[PDB]
């Protein structure tokens, strides 16, 4: 299958008391393996999945001297933006950055990314040609011109086409047996009466990885996912995920309904009837 290595920076100006917090975070597919935090005691890049740990002490040194450098730039950036907009220093504002790369089953580089947001709105982003940028507004247009003259896309592109792809391979190697193994979901249907003429028929899938799943219902055949309750897929805490999907149904009618789970790690679709 295909896999992705992505990094997630967050830069948080806390106005009143203290310089901004800088939280980067590292993922290979749905699995966090790295984290940095700017207001720690002598802050350091740290492992957060086991398989990355057998990596050179060269590595963690170079990664903190990087994470720190980014915290600097993003504190100046947070200020730079605030003045672009003429916003009061009274305010707390955030910059987020996401970059990464999707790779295909052979190693085909599917997509590269580098997107910035200010206060949750798109700010600037690297286009699919990995050579131009989209600036959302007029403030962003000054960042764009700055980055076109500095050749920033060209160094982003090389990172995404090289280091990112190469290192996603190294990561999936270190963590075979973890990363390249899909956990089938534990499926059960429960039933919770509510009235004397209406019950809830929850349909659970537990402990699966990766978080990609789909649950769907069926009333005698007819897809009845229409106003069935689907909850956001949550982490279990052990690195696997859960999601359930209930339908409300009148008494005696349970025997006609039906739930189906498909997930990577399943050989053919699971089918659940009361």
């Amino acid at each position: 299958g295909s896999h992705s290595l992505r990094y997630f920076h967050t830069a948080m100006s806390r106005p009143g008391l203290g310089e901004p917090r800088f939280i980067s975070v590292g993922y290979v597919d749905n699995t966090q393996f790295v984290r940095f935090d700017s207001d720690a005691p002598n802050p350091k890049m740290e492992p957060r999945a086991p398989w990355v740990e057998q990596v050179g002490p060269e590595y963690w040194d170079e990664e903190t001297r990087n994470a720190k450098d980014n915290a600097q730039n993003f504190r100046v950036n947070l200020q730079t933006v605030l003045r672009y907009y003429n916003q009061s220093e009274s305010g707390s504002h955030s910059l987020q950055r996401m970059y990464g790369c999707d790779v295909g089953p052979d190693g085909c580089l599917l997509r590269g990314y580098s997107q910035v947001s200010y206060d949750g709105k798109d700010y600037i982003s690297l286009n699919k040609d990995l050579r131009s940028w989209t600036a959302a507004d007029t403030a962003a247009q000054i960042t764009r011109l700055k980055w076109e003259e500095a050749g920033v896309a060209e160094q982003e592109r090389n990172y995404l086409e090289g280091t990112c792809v190469e290192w996603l391979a190294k990561y999936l190697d270190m963590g075979k047996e973890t990363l390249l193994r899909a956990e089938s979901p534990n499926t059960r249907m429960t039933r919770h009466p509510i009235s004397d003429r209406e019950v809830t028929l929850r349909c659970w899938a537990l402990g699966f990885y990766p978080a990609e799943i789909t649950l769907t219902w069926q009333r005698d055949g007819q897809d009845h996912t229409q106003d069935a309750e689907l909850v956001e897929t949550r982490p279990a805490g052990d690195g696997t995920f859960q999601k359930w999907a209930a339908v409300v149904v009148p008494s005696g009618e349970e025997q006609r309904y039906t739930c189906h789970v498909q997930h990577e790690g399943l050989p053919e679709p699971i089918t659940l009837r009361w």
Partner: peptide, 9 residues
Amino acid sequence: RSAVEDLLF
């Protein structure tokens, strides 16, 4: 690995 970036807005 992380990306070495001089991203200044």
